[PDB]
Amino acid sequence: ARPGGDTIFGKIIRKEIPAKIIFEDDRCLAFHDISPQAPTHFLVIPKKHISQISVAEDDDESLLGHLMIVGKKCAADLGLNKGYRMVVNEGSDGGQSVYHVHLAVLGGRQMHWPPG
Amino acid sequence: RPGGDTIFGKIIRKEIPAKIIFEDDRCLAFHDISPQAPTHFLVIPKKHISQISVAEDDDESLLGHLMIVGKKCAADLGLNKGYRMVVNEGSDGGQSVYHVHLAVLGGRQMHWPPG
> Regarding beta strands A28-32 and A84-90, do their DSSP bridges make them parallel or antiparallel, or are they unpaired?
unpaired
Determine contact, residues A13/A32, Cβ cutoff 8 Å.
Answer: no
Cβ within 8 Å, pair A87-B36: no
Cis status of the peptide bond prior to A3, with omega within 30 of 0: no
In a domain, A85, yes or no: yes
**What is the side-by-side order of every strand in the sheet holding A103-107?**
A21-24, A28-32, A40-46, A103-107, A84-90, B83-89, B102-106, B39-45, B27-31, B20-23
Cβ within 8 Å, pair B59-A80: no
How were these coordinates obtained? X-ray
Question: What is the Cα–Cα distance from B8 to A14, expressed in whole angstroms?
Answer: 42
The residue among A27, A56, A93 whose CA lies nearest residue B83 is A93
Cis status of the peptide bond prior to A114, with omega within 30 of 0: yes
In a domain, B114, yes or no: no
In a domain, B26, yes or no: yes
Q: What residues contact A114, with CB distance under 8 A and at least 6 apart?
A: B36, B37, B105, B115
How many residues are listed for chain A in this entry? 116
In a domain, A72, yes or no: yes
Q: Which residues of B29-41 are buried (b: 16+ CB within 10 A; e: fewer)?
A: bbebeeeebebbb
The parent domain of residue A41 ranges over 8-107
**Chain A interface includes B37 (CB < 8 A):** yes
In a domain, A12, yes or no: yes
C-alpha R_g of chain A: 14
Element (H, E) at A3: none
In a domain, B86, yes or no: yes
Number of Cα atoms under 13 Å in the Cβ half of residue A13 = 20
Q: What CATH number is attached to the domain comprising B96? A: 3.30.428.10
Q: What residues contact B66, with CB distance under 8 A and at least 6 apart?
A: B27, B43, B44, B45, B102
| Residue B60 Cα distances to A34, A65, B69, B73, B82, angstroms | 27, 4, 14, 20, 25
The residues in A 56-115 lying below 8 A from B, measured between CB atoms, are 56, 58, 60-66, 68-69, 71-72, 75-76, 80, 82-96, 104, 106-115
- The CB density around residue B1, as the number of other CB atoms within 10 Å, is 9
* Nearest-neighbour CA in chain A from B47: distance (Å): 15
Q: Which residues of A46-78 are buried (b: 16+ CB within 10 A; e: fewer)?
A: bbeebebbbebeeebbebbbbbbbbbbbbbeeb
Helical ranges in chain B per DSSP H: 7-12, 60-76, 90-93
In a domain, A115, yes or no: no
Q: How many domains does chain B have?
A: 1
Determine contact, residues B22/B95, Cβ cutoff 8 Å.
Answer: no
The residue among A52, A7, A15 whose CA lies nearest residue A31 is A15
Best A42, A44, A74, A87 member to test B by mutation, with max B CBs in 10 Å, is A87
Resolution (angstroms) stands at 2.0
> Which residues does chain A have within 8 Å of residue B94's beta carbon, measured at their own beta carbons?
83, 85, 110-113
Report the C-alpha dihedral over residues B24, B86, A5, A16, rounded to 10 degrees. -120
Question: What is the Cα–Cα distance from B21 to A92, expressed in whole angstroms?
Answer: 23
Question: What is the Cα–Cα distance from A57 to B10, expressed in whole angstroms?
Answer: 31
Contacts 24+ apart (CB under 8 A), A19-26: A22/A74, A22/A77, A22/A78, A23/A70, A23/A73, A23/A74, A25/A70
Question: Annotated catalytic residue: which of B31, B99, B101, B111?
Answer: B101
In a domain, A112, yes or no: no
